[PDB]
Design a protein around this nucleic acid. Structure first.
Lengths: 296, 453, 513, 315
RNA sequence: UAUAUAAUAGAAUAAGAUAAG
RNA sequence: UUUUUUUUUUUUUUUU
């Protein structure tokens, strides 16, 4: 598991946020340094790769390029990001240099009018959930159903459509999974609606649901590899207690300047899984898991 | 011991490490040389890592470019260029640094182009190793250095490097003569952000590198001086002389640090060797500080041990003593008699410095003068006009008058007559030279000299 | 033998004009019969090698030149066949560039510039290739580890076009060679796998092996083809080779096959004939069985018994996996474990840093390894190898040596200095060093200061139990820096906001300081 | 001393003479001071040398792998497309004009090559050389290598070794010839007079004039031109003898024995090494250096220094 | 009625002073 | 602690 982050260009950081909130450049670089340190200390990411600065502030959103669905690294369409083509090529060069995939799957770049946005895709036990809304029309949903939905026994990979209102952030911002069967959402209309919809879609599975303060950006490295850490914003302390009570490990992270700039912790990193291409029917070495000699 | 080529390269690298940073045991070097003499990779297939390790260990242990193992490794590096990734690039570059064949130059240039192309995708380890390896080859690829400096600055803005990495980076970027004030400022900031994680052993080399690079900013030197003043008590003679040299290189007149350093130096006067004494005297000459009690102590210690004096040490010591004015009687005799024995080790400029220092102090010994004069025929080719003038004046004061020795010096003078006759100083020196040698010894230089140019 | 002696003398003095074919014939008769002292006589072989080096080796096949070089190397003469140049403009034919590549592959001397040159003289004349020539050049390019994916993709498209003209072996070889190429496109791979599964009813065991290798290399993105081959091969499971069953196990582990019904059948078939496996195949079968959670009470015993006959002469790179398998499994493996420890004791000289670290780590918590004589030898060897250890191998070795009770303050101090030279990024890369130091409980104050300065930033991402362990280590070492304890108490406050005496004594002491 | 950089702490000195002893290459290392007794030559060999002026050692002095290494080093010395490193460390080389020729000769190789440096300190040949010189000290003077062409290697005319060594005062010398290849009368085996070392009570025959533009017959037949009638009477009974040498065979030659080398008419090159050992109490004749760029001696100063190292010292 | 064939791969790993323009 | 990066450049008039 490799995490890719981009250093912020100090000179071109905007003076004021999108709404009008002023920001501090020095505090921004300090918080990015702390974020890089606490991402290195995750004890699950094998290596953290730092990208060179680019003369843009929206290039910090390195997660608007790719979605990892199952075992495929799907590429998001270039519809409103025509100025980020070279940025995407440079990021792909960084991924190639780290031993990742040579290129990406173009299943969405060729479909007509397939306007999709990352973050609307949230992983879940043997499936994904996509958010129907302003940034993701029905053609993306039906293409994803065609490509990934499987309704067979012992091989089911089901994708769920979660309709959301027209003034909601990406589904990955306020909806996520963590630990062994733990769910995290914001305590507002969007979180309750998404939780209820997923309860209807998967009724026979009972799940732990944890409610967080609205506007509290979090990040959990959910996947096949079991983990317990959940990065959470430092300002909110009720959410930290809620996460700790569920049996998970919370890690406070200072993220005020990005919040003033509109960049979430989820959209600032690009987690990827690279598996060594075994040649000749061989198996590589895994990581030391479990306790050795339980019975001595 | 019969082993596979990879299993031989691993032990070769271990032997290199033990002989390099764990005492230079001659038996380890002899065993490694014997093992590598019979090693060949003509048939067996190996990774790029194993071949690079074998080449590096062979080159380190004195093997030149004429050996079979070196030729095979260089052939592998030339053919399979795409298998030499960034991980195994610095090893190959460091191995090829000493080699000066055509294949070595081609390999170094190809690795330089590869590193300059991929300079934005490296990490702290790879960047540090690459810049350290390219420091040793003497290459002059400024675009690569700029790319690596930019990557260093961006990677250190997030607090990635540490003490050893900073020391290696500063040494590599100072040896290559890259006066990038922003890069060294970033390195200094990263060092000062490493509170109490930069020990004395990791602080002295940083100061030495920052002094050698020659930074115009004088505010930076103050912080290094204060941190050294805090750390004086935990030092041996090596680091005391090292900071004498470093703060002589800075050129700022500090008072408290110099006093405490002199106190610690006179404390450890029983541990000083020839090189430390020479370095201290040279540093005092460079900074101009006159300290006669310390000079007396250093002169007495240098009198105590004279066999350890190398040609560089001898030259620095005699030049410092002659410039300061203080000079002993028997110490000079011992130094001259010793330099007569090792006259075949002086460099192009060390020989000139030693001869001129002995001539300027009016100390003439026949054995030393004869040895230096006879040796001054293989070094006249590598002499600048000022050094040639100094050597010629030393010979004139020595009264050699030997054509076999004089004609190369006069050939060098004629081949550099513009820089010889237009020196802002030394006019009286040339006048005395020509007074001694007369007009008929060398006509053309006389004709030029009576024309003033 | 006057005539034989005269012939040998004339050959020794380099007075006989030898052709490459004559040298090949002499090498063949010397390597096959060897009734005379040809190979035992050094001078005659030196003269023959001198004749072969100056000869014209274009008139012999790459196999013949390779055999000549092998015969010369068997006696001590370092021989290497000449490198053939790229054919000139007239001799540019589809059957000659393939010959260049084949000789480059056989003689094991690859030049990438020559590969590029013959890949740029193949594109204009690529329309003259026979259907089998494409399937040959694909495998030749794959075996040379070429990074040119566009050329291989074009070749694969052409191979797909001449589908009906190719045998099953050619299709399987093309599929596996395509799978070995890293940069090739995925649509071509999907088309090739569809082609393979359409012509899949004619496969020999060799084609099964090639297809399984291709699937294992490709990964879990191609589950449907593996499902098809599993469903087809269920008829042949009882009458099947052991190697292909092991490859089935490896593919089962790789794809994470959720259909655990056929896995039992294939695993039972493999364990029936597991006696006919070599080192690597047996090790791979062990790993695949462990990762599929199949180690039962009886099959583990049979596989261990099979391993026993191999454990005496195992390679140093095949000792750690078996140790890990024994460690994870809760069954009885004392005899195998002892044999493996003896083999590791024998191999301690040639073990690299990573293998030594893994061996020490697996045996960290093993009770019988406490008194076994490997502890001192491995400690000394690790001290010697400490210069070559990496950030993780050093941590593994330190953890293994600390858990075994090996006490040597010099080794732990040197490990601390090496770690300070490398730097730490996880708590798991710093804790073994701390417990190793706490074993002796003594270190210079500068070491304590550096360790505390490393620990303090890391205290914001530690669980409460890990905070307890870190506090124990710091108290044992004797630290006095206040900011470290401040950060530790700040982290502790979040988990237990109450200062009530409910928490143990160490926690109150920590928050007090 | 000075400070050596970390990546230069294993390098050997520019001049290999600076190494006090012998490197570990080729044979392992020199034995103990009391373990040199197993290399003594038989008294019959000494008597044969004193009677004939030459003798071949009973056994080869180098194993085959060492011979391959030495041949490879000789090949690398004669490189032309990429000139050998430390070329300027030789007394004289045949590639000083960068062109070359059918015969390649290299002098002073021991300062610019591994293995060749260790060949000087071989106990098997040094002990025998010391035994030849009345069991005394031995000092290396210089060594050379000859490599003949593939099919047009020229033949060295008749020669006496001492004809050029006029700077050394007494007749105290010995020559060791090592054959790195297999030699013959058609390939470069040495042909020498069985008894020329005791002619004219130790005098030297005048230099022989040869035409370098013709075949081997006149080159080998100039011996009659250079000798007198009585020397012809001695020569007629015992004609010159060509000794065929295999790999590793060593030949001890007196400095006053007339010897020549046949040309190369085989199908490849042939290489041979000559090493010239003095003894103790060997003095100079004139002022100045004996060899180019060497130590300058006095009129009758004893020969010593780093250019002429001591390779074996009894007692 | 002929003198001759030759292809299986495994390992992730950092030392540090040149008498300058 | 805030300075900087991303071309197929090809036009130098000597008798060396």
């Amino acid at each position: 598991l490799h995490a890719f982050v981009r250093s912020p260009h100090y000179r071109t950081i905007p003076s004021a946020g999108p709404n009008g909130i002023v920001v501090n450049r020095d505090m921004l670089v300090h918080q990015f340094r702390d974020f890089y340190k606490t991402l290195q200390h995750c004890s699950l990411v094998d290596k953290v790769h730092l990208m060179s600065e680019r003369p843009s502030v929206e290039a910090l959103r390195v997660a608007d390029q790719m979605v990892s669905i199952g075992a495929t690294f799907l590429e998001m369409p270039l519809t409103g990001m025509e100025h980020r083509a070279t940025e995407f090529m440079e990021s792909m060069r960084y991924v190639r240099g780290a031993g990742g995939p040579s290129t990406l799957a173009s299943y969405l770049q060729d479909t007509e009018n397939c306007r999709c946005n990352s973050g609307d895709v949230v992983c879940l036990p043997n499936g994904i959930a996509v958010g129907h809304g302003p940034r993701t029309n029905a053609v993306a949903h039906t293409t994803l159903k065609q490509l990934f939905e499987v309704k067979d026994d012992q091989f089911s990979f089901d994708v769920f459509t979660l309709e959301q209102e027209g003034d909601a952030p990406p589904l990955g911002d306020y909806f996520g999974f963590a630990g062994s069967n733990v769910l995290l959402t914001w305590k507002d209309e969007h979180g309750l609606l998404a939780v209820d919809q997923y309860q209807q879609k998967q009724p026979h599975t009972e799940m732990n649901v944890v409610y967080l303060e609205p506007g509290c950006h979090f990040l959990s490295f959910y996947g096949v590899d079991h983990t317990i850490d959940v990065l959470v914003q430092k300002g909110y302390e009720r959410s930290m207690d809620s996460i700790a009570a569920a049996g998970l490990n919370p890690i406070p992270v200072q993220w005020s300047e990005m919040d003033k700039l509109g960049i979430s912790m989820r959209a600032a990193v690009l987690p990827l899984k690279f598996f060594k291409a075994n040649v000749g029917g061989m198996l590589s070495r895994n990581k030391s898991r479990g306790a050795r000699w339980q019975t001595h | 011991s019969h082993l596979s080529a990879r299993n031989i390269a691993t032990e070769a690298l271990q032997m290199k490490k033990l002989h390099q940073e764990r005492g230079g045991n001659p038996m380890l070097a002899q065993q490694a040389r014997r093992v590598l003499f019979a090693t060949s990779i003509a048939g067996q297939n190996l990774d790029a890592r194993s071949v690079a390790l074998l080449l590096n260990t062979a080159v380190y242990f004195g093997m030149e470019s004429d050996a079979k193992l070196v030729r095979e490794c260089i052939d592998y590096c030339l053919k399979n260029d795409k298998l030499i990734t960034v991980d195994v690039l610095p090893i190959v570059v460091t191995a090829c640094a000493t080699l000066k064949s055509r294949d070595a130059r081609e390999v170094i240039e190809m690795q330089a182009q590869k590193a300059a192309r991929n300079a934005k995708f490296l990490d702290a380890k790879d960047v540090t190793n690459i810049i350290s390896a390219f420091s040793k080859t003497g290459i002059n690829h400024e675009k690569l250095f700029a790319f690596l400096s930019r990557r260093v600055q961006t990677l250190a803005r997030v607090g990635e490097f540490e003490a050893a990495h900073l020391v290696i980076l500063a040494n590599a970027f100072s040896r290559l003569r890259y006066r990038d004030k922003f890069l060294f400022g970033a390195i200094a900031r990263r060092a000062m952000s490493l509170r109490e994680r930069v020990t004395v052993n990791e602080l002295v080399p940083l100061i030495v590198a920052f002094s050698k690079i020659g930074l115009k900013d004088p505010k930076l030197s103050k912080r290094f001086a204060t941190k050294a003043m805090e750390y004086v008590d935990q030092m041996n003679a090596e680091q005391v002389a090292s900071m004498f040299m470093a703060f002589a290189y800075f050129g700022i007149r500090y008072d408290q640090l110099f006093g405490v350093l002199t106190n610690r130096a006179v404390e450890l006067i029983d541990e000083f060797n020839a090189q430390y004494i020479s370095t201290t005297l040279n540093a005092f000459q460079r900074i101009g500080i006159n300290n006669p009690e310390l000079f007396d102590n250093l002169a007495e210690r240098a009198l105590a041990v004279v066999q350890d004096h190398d040609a560089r040490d001898i030259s620095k010591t005699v030049t410092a003593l002659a410039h300061f004015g203080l000079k002993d009687e028997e110490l000079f005799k011992r130094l001259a008699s010793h330099a007569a024995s090792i006259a075949d080790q002086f460099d192009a400029m060390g020989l000139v410095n030693t001869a001129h220092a002995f001539a300027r102090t009016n100390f003439l010994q026949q054995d030393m003068a004869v040895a230096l004069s006879e040796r001054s025929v293989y070094v006249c080719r590598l002499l600048d006009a000022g050094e040639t003038r100094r050597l010629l004046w030393a010979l004139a004061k020595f009264q050699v008058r030997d054509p076999k020795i004089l004609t190369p010096v006069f050939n060098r003078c004629l081949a550099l007559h513009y820089d010889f006759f237009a020196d802002p100083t030394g006019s009286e020196e040339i006048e005395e030279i020509f007074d001694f040698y007369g007009p008929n010894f060398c006509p053309p230089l006389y004709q030029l000299y009576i024309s003033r140019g | 033998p006057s005539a034989l002696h005269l012939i040998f003398e004339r050959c020794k003095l380099n007075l006989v004009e030898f052709t490459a074919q004559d040298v090949y014939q002499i090498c063949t008769t010397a390597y096959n019969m060897d009734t005379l002292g040809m190979l035992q006589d050094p001078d005659f072989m030196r003269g023959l090698h001198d004749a072969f080096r100056r000869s014209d080796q274009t008139v012999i096949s790459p196999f013949q030149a390779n055999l000549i070089a092998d015969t010369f190397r068997k006696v001590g003469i370092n021989s290497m066949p000449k490198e053939v140049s790229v054919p000139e403009e007239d001799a540019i034919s589809p059957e000659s560039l393939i010959l260049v590549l084949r000789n480059m592959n056989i003689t094991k001397q690859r030049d990438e510039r020559k590969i590029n040159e013959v890949l740029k003289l193949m594109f204009p004349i690529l329309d003259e290739f026979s259907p089998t020539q494409l399937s040959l050049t694909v495998t030749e390019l794959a075996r040379l580890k070429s990074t040119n994916a566009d050329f291989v993709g074009k070749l694969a498209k052409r191979i797909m076009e001449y589908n009906d003209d190719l045998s099953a072996l050619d299709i399987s070889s093309a599929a596996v060679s395509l799978a070995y190429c890293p940069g090739i496109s995925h649509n071509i791979l999907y088309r090739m796998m569809q082609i393979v599964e359409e012509r899949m009813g004619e496969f020999q065991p060799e084609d099964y092996i090639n297809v399984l290798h291709a699937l294992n290399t490709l990964g879990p993105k191609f589950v449907n083809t593996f499902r098809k081959i599993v469903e087809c091969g269920l008829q042949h499971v009882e009458n099947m080779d052991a190697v292909t069953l092991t490859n089935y196990m490896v593919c089962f582990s790789t794809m994470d096959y959720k259909q655990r019904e056929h896995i039992d059948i294939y695993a039972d078939a493999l364990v029936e004939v597991a006696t006919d496996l070599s080192e690597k195949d047996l090790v791979m079968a062990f790993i695949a069985l462990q990762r599929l959670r199949l180690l039962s009470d009886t099959m583990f015993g049979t596989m261990a018994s099979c391993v026993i006959r191999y454990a005496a002469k195992m390679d140093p790179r095949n000792i750690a996996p078996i140790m890990d398998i024994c460690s994870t499994v809760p069954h009885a493996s004392d005899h195998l474990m002892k044999v493996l420890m003896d083999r590791a004791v024998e191999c301690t000289r040639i073990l690299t840093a990573n293998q030594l670290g893994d061996i020490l780590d697996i045996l960290g918590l093993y009770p019988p390894a406490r008194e076994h004589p490997l502890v001192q030898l491995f400690g000394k060897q690790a001290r010697l190898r400490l210069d070559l250890m990496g950030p993780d191998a050093l941590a593994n070795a330190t953890r293994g040596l600390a858990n075994l009770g090996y006490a040597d303050p010099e080794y732990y101090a040197q490990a601390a200095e090496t770690g300070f030279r490398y730097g730490f990024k996880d708590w798991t890369l710093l804790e073994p060093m701390l417990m190793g130091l706490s074993i002796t409980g003594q270190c210079p104050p500068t070491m304590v200061r550096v360790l505390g300065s490393h620990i303090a930033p890391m205290a914001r991402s530690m669980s409460l139990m890990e905070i307890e362990r870190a506090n124990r280590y710091l108290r044992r070492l004797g630290c006095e820096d206040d900011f470290v304890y401040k950060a530790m108490a700040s982290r502790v406050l979040q988990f237990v906001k109450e200062v009530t005496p409910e928490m143990p004594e160490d926690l109150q002491v920590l928050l007090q300081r | 001393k000075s400070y050596v950089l970390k990546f230069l702490r294993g390098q050997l000195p520019e001049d290999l003479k600076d190494v006090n002893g012998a490197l570990g290459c080729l044979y392992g290392t020199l034995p103990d001071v009391d373990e040199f007794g197993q290399f003594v030559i038989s008294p019959d060999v000494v008597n044969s040398f004193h009677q004939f002026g030459y003798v071949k050692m009973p056994i080869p002095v180098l194993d085959h792998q060492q011979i391959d290494k030495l041949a490879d080093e000789v090949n690398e010395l004669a490189n032309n497309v990429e000139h050998h490193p430390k070329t300027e460390r030789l007394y004289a080389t045949s590639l000083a004009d960068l062109t070359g020729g059918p015969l390649f000769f290299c002098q002073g190789q021991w300062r610019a090559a591994w293995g060749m440096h260790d060949l000087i300190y071989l106990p098997t040949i040094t002990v025998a050389a010391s035994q030849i010189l009345n069991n005394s000290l031995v000092r290396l003077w210089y060594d050379e290598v000859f490599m003949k062409a593939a099919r047009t290697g020229p033949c060295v005319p008749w020669q006496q070794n001492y004809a050029r060594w006029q700077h050394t005062k007494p007749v105290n010398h010995v020559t060791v010839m090592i054959a790195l290849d297999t030699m013959n009368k058609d390939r470069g085996a040495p042909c020498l007079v069985p008894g020329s070392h005791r002619w004219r009570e130790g005098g030297l025959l005048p230099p022989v004039s040869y035409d370098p533009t013709k075949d081997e017959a006149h080159q080998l037949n100039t011996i009659w031109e250079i000798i007198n009638e009585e020397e012809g009477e001695m020569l007629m009974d015992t004609p010159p003898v060509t000794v065929d040498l295999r790999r590793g065979e060593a030949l001890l030659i007196h400095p006053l024995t007339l010897f020549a080398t046949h040309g190369n008419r085989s199908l490849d090159a042939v290489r041979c090494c000559f090493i010239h050992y003095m003894g103790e109490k060997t003095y100079a004749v004139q002022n100045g250096p004996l060899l180019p760029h060497t130590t300058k001696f006095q009129a009758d100063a004893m020969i010593q220094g780093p250019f002429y190292p001591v390779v074996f010292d009894p007692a």
